């Protein structure tokens, strides 16, 4: 997931954002942490909480 152009994802094992490769982003989760994925197709944006 994210190696190609077909996915925009967050990896909380390392704190990375993946799309056509990896870039640092955010912080790693702990056990029980909840990742909220939000997509806005009017502003054309992806947000992670």
């Amino acid at each position: 997931l994210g190696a190609d152009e077909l996915a925009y994802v967050f990896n909380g094992h390392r704190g990375q954002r993946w799309h056509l490769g990896s870039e640092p982003f955010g912080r790693p989760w702990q056990s029980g942490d909840v990742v909220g994925c939000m997509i806005d197709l009017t502003e054309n944006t992806i947000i992670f909480t």
Partner: protein, 40 residues
């Protein structure tokens, strides 16, 4: 109310900018300090 005054007043905005630039205030540090403070 403060933001409304800011948007309405030309002088208020420009003095804000002047303060920031002369005093070398980061502001991006204040906003992103949590991740920075945590240094991950």
């Amino acid at each position: 109310e403060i933001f409304i005054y800011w948007s309405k007043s030309h002088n208020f905005k420009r003095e804000e900018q002047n303060f920031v630039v002369q005093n070398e205030i980061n502001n991006m540090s204040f906003l992103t300090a949590d991740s920075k403070s945590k240094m991950a």
